[PDB]
Design a protein around this ligand. Structure first.
Ligand SMILES: CCCCC[C@H](CN(O)CO)C(=O)NCNC(=O)c1cc2cccc(OC)c2o1
Ligand SMILES: [Zn+2]
Ligand SMILES: [Zn+2]
Length: 200
């Protein structure tokens, strides 16, 4: 679910950043590691902000809302992190938003790959399962990626941990594909981000 909007692609793949107050040393170390993980597998690079107009700010905030997707432009933008959502893999996902990705399950073609089980969604959290409009996404010829760091888990916003809100439709390698990994950028994520940023 890469943005279709070229103004949201950070020019030259260089993203200035600031780390705000109220984090521990350890949380700040994880931020740098997550930024470096992006740097290792793509041409995207994070740079400590000096005088740039547009830049990201790591802000202490309760988990959930919101990390701006892609470059806002004309000023600072938030990448929001809190106590329960600050592990390496979560921050990598959040930087996925920064660089221009929405959630994989909101791809316009998602109904060919997953079922949404509405009845299992926590009340008032249904908006998290809305498809993006076709005009807002350009997937760049890349197939729907179950292993994506941007893909929800089977029971994300579920009323109970044993109930699925998202179910993949078909078996891949003879078994239903696992979703919701927060370990690393997937092969699919790397391929897609390289196209988005026109990496060499
Ligand atoms: C109101 C939308 C709730 C979004 C919450 C999620 C949390 N994560 O999954 C983080 O990984 C989120 O941040 N998704 C990505 N960002 C957005 O969807 C989003 C929309 C939006 C609209 C106006 C202003 C914003 O400022 C940060 C926005 O973020
Ligand atoms: Zn997200
Ligand atoms: Zn994808």
């Amino acid at each position: 679910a890469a943005t279709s909007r070229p103004e949201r692609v950070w020019p030259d793949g260089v993203i200035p950043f600031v780390i705000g107050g109220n984090f521990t040393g350890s949380q700040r170390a994880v931020f740098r590691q997550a930024m470096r993980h992006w740097e290792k597998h793509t041409c995207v690079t994070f740079l400590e902000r000096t005088d740039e107009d547009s830049y990201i700010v790591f802000t202490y905030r309760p988990c959930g809302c919101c990390s701006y997707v892609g470059r806002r432009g004309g000023g600072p933008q938030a990448i929001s992190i809190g106590k329960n959502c600050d592990k390496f893999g979560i921050v990598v996902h959040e930087l996925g938003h920064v660089v221009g990705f929405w959630h994989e399950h909101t791809r316009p073609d998602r109904d060919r790959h997953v079922s949404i089980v509405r009845e299992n969604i926590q009340p008032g959290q249904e908006y998290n399962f809305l498809k993006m409009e076709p005009q807002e996404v350009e997937s760049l010829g890349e197939t729907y990626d179950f292993d994506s760091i941007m893909h929800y888990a089977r029971n994300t916003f579920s009323r109970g941990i044993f109930l699925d809100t998202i179910v993949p439709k078909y078996e891949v390698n003879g078994v239903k594909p696992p979703i919701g990994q927060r370990t690393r950028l997937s092969k699919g994520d790397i391929a897609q981000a390289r196209k988005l940023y026109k990496c060499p």
